[PDB]
Amino acid sequence: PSLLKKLLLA
Amino acid sequence: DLKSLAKRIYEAYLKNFNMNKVKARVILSGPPFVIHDMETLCMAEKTLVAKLVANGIQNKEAEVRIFHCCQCTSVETVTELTEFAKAIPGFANLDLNDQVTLLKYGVYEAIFAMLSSVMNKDGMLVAYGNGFITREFLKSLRKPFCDIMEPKFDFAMKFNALELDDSDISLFVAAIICCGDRPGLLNVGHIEKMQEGIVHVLRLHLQSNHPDDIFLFPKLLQKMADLRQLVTEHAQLVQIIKKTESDAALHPLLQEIYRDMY
Ligand SMILES: CC(C)(Sc1ccc(CCN(CCCCC2CCCCC2)C(=O)NC2CCCCC2)cc1)C(=O)O
């Protein structure tokens, strides 16, 4: 779960 | 309607970016604090990034302190770009992994395009509109740090001569993000179709908003290609810094964006 994907899921 | 696509994208841009071109020009016309030498750099640090030098890392070289502040700004801008992307009609219907890929390759092209809105020939507005760093001061930094911003000023001076407004730039940034030729996309066709819609709206919008410049659309296609090259070169310099500079460690999010990029 990359940090970019984390931002997208925020 | 395509007019609705253009307005929705513009509204998403006004909502999600703290700095826009009208605001920046209002400030850049006249009171941001001017950073033009080491004395004023240190003063600005104590007023605008107090925690950074509360102790702190202020025994690190000025160039390294500036680089850290720049990284923090980029981390913030990636968040704003991600929220903007999520508001581009159709982007949220893409595969989540494709959404990651589009952001990964598009963010720095979008950053350097948007940086133009805060630059003039003498310097750039920074720190949420509260500082202004001179172009000459940045050129005066020791190598390699003096080599980061100058190509971006060169890009910005020509980009700014196109006299775009935020309604144009919002569509241009959307076009940069929704790019079907990024490496590793899963659903290229769906992304190309989405890109085609945004580019179609961009072409029509420029015809309406810039009736005086019959070549503005192909000029902007060329600017997109110029930005890809600018980003490739920028990433190469970032790698020189990460390799030769011990105090210049990259924030994990930026490391992730740069990894396996170019
Ligand atoms: C960080 C790398 C590794 S290199 C890099 C990348 C980008 C930049 C431009 C950062 N910046 C000056 C931020 C200057 C902060 C200021 C420094 C002096 C003390 C007071 C605070 C700025 O204003 N950016 C805008 C944000 C509004 C939207 C457009 C972009 C500089 C270096 C990266 O690749 O990310």
Side-chain angles (χ1 to χ4, degrees), chain A, chain B residues 1-54 56-262:
Chain A
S2 70
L3 307 157
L4 271 178
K5 185 173 288 172
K6 230 199 65 206
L7 283 174
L8 279 162
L9 299 170
Chain B
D1 194 299
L2 304 155
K3 280 40 189 183
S4 169
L5 178 56
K7 187 167 187 163
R8 289 163 73 199
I9 286 170
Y10 184 30
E11 286 171 354
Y13 167 106
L14 294 175
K15 160 165 144 45
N16 282 294
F17 297 109
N18 76 82
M19 184 56 65
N20 59 61
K21 185 165 172 173
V22 169
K23 278 166 140 204
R25 286 179 148 196
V26 155
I27 292 161
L28 283 173
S29 83
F33 180 81
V34 171
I35 300 163
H36 64 92
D37 66 6
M38 286 309 181
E39 184 192 28
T40 55
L41 171 72
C42 293
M43 294 168 61
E45 290 174 314
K46 287 178 187 194
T47 56
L48 299 177
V49 293
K51 175 66 185 180
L52 187 72
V53 295
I57 73 153
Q58 64 169 146
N59 268 341
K60 295 191 161 196
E61 285 172 278
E63 287 84 354
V64 171
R65 303 193 311 262
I66 292 164
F67 190 72
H68 180 264
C69 290
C70 289
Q71 297 195 46
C72 292
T73 302
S74 291
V75 170
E76 300 277 10
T77 314
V78 169
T79 297
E80 292 181 340
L81 276 161
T82 301
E83 292 303 306
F84 172 70
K86 291 200 283 189
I88 297 166
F91 184 89
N93 309 106
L94 297 175
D95 183 85
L96 178 62
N97 286 313
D98 281 348
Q99 299 181 36
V100 166
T101 296
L102 294 178
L103 282 164
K104 166 190 195 73
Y105 283 98
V107 288
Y108 277 98
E109 290 175 18
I111 287 173
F112 298 145
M114 295 189 298
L115 188 51
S116 308
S117 297
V118 297
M119 288 178 150
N120 65 24
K121 58 183 174 50
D122 297 333
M124 62 188 285
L125 192 60
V126 303
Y128 297 86
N130 295 290
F132 178 86
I133 308 172
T134 69
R135 181 174 185 176
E136 285 304 319
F137 176 68
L138 287 160
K139 283 166 61 161
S140 81
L141 299 183
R142 76 160 172 87
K143 274 193 128 57
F145 294 101
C146 55
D147 298 331
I148 297 166
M149 298 309 305
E150 187 62 8
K152 286 63 165 189
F153 277 104
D154 277 349
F155 175 89
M157 295 304 95
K158 295 178 289 199
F159 194 75
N160 286 346
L162 305 178
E163 292 297 344
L164 305 185
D165 65 38
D166 293 299
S167 75
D168 311 310
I169 293 163
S170 66
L171 294 171
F172 183 78
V173 173
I176 285 169
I177 294 172
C178 296
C179 178
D181 74 330
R182 303 303 193 185
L185 291 171
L186 301 172
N187 303 272
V188 173
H190 286 177
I191 293 167
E192 293 175 349
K193 297 301 307 187
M194 183 180 45
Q195 162 169 55
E196 184 195 352
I198 288 155
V199 172
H200 178 43
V201 165
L202 173 67
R203 185 176 32 247
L204 299 178
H205 179 83
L206 297 174
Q207 166 190 327
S208 306
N209 201 29
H210 296 270
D212 53 321
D213 185 347
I214 66 170
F215 279 112
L216 185 54
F217 178 70
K219 289 179 186 179
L220 289 184
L221 297 180
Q222 182 184 64
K223 295 302 183 201
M224 293 175 186
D226 290 349
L227 285 166
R228 194 171 287 183
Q229 182 64 29
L230 196 71
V231 171
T232 299
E233 293 166 349
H234 177 75
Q236 281 157 4
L237 178 65
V238 174
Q239 173 64 18
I240 290 179
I241 291 167
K242 172 191 171 205
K243 185 189 181 170
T244 61
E245 302 283 345
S246 35
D247 295 329
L250 275 184
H251 184 286
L253 177 60
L254 308 186
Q255 284 181 10
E256 179 174 310
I257 289 162
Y258 283 118
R259 187 151 288 247
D260 304 318
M261 187 190 296
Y262 289 131

